[PDB]
Amino acid sequence: HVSLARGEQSVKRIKEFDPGKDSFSVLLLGIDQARSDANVLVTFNRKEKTAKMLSIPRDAYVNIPGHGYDKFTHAHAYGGVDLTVKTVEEMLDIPVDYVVESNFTAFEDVVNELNGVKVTVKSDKVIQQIKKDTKGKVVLQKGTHTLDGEEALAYVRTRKSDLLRGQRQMEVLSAIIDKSKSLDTMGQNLKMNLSLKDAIGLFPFITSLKSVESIQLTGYDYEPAGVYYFKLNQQKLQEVKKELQNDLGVL
Ligand SMILES: [Cl-]
């Protein structure tokens, strides 16, 4: 039961947060000192019953408070969950109400604890890269199949120096929600700033959204000195912030 050192509620919030029944956000972090490979923010509009997913690029060039501009991924390295939460709140200028961190092991247990997740594979390029990544232990086929954790894991790690990987992560995560609604878990290696009891209460809601939507931060390669960063498009960032603050109903 993690507790951000930032207190009872996000410092980004002006009014008092209802535990509770009003709009909120969740940061998912997957690791695998150390760096986060999965970086997905979800905002949940209560009144609308809608959700918005955003993957923060591993290499996004952002200010890490107390550390200067750097790759987004290093935040969790320099300061763990709390530093990363700060970085996201500073960068997106929204409250991050909940965070859940996990290694990809816990991830794999979840998937076939659910008896696999539905995923429609479409690309031979992808089938091949996984084939090679895994030295043939994992071999996907085209079309709609139910993957087990090993297969889902491999799908979610595959990577050509940027992200589309984030797109695969959001794809499987929404698949997990879907597969979960047709029935702790646990629920074991998840570290959250949430109690399981509280978590359980959010499930009904999370599990009956009227729609899910992905958003995307666009940008460009910035390689000052053979060090790779993804420079964010500032106009797109501002738009995204404005859309996020709305869902949350802040500002
Ligand atoms: Cl695919």
Swiss-Prot record:
It is found in: Cell membrane. Disruption phenotype: Single mutant has no effect on cell growth or morphology under normal growth conditions. Triple disruption of tagTUV genes is not viable. Residues 1-250 are extracellular. One of its GO terms (molecular function) is transferase activity. Pathway: Cell wall biogenesis. It is an enzyme of class 2 (transferase). One of its GO terms (biological process) is cell wall organization. One of its GO terms (cellular component) is plasma membrane. Coiled coil: none annotated. Keywords: Cell membrane, Cell wall biogenesis/degradation, Membrane, Signal-anchor, Transferase, Transmembrane, Transmembrane helix. It is a single-pass type II membrane protein. Its EC number is 2.7.8.-. Its main location: membrane. It comes from the Bacteria. Interacts with MreB. May catalyze the final step in cell wall teichoic acid biosynthesis, the transfer of the anionic cell wall polymers (APs) from their lipid-linked precursor to the cell wall peptidoglycan (PG). Belongs to the LytR/CpsA/Psr (LCP) family. This is Polyisoprenyl-teichoic acid--peptidoglycan teichoic acid transferase TagT. The chain holds residues 51 to 322 of 322 of the full protein.
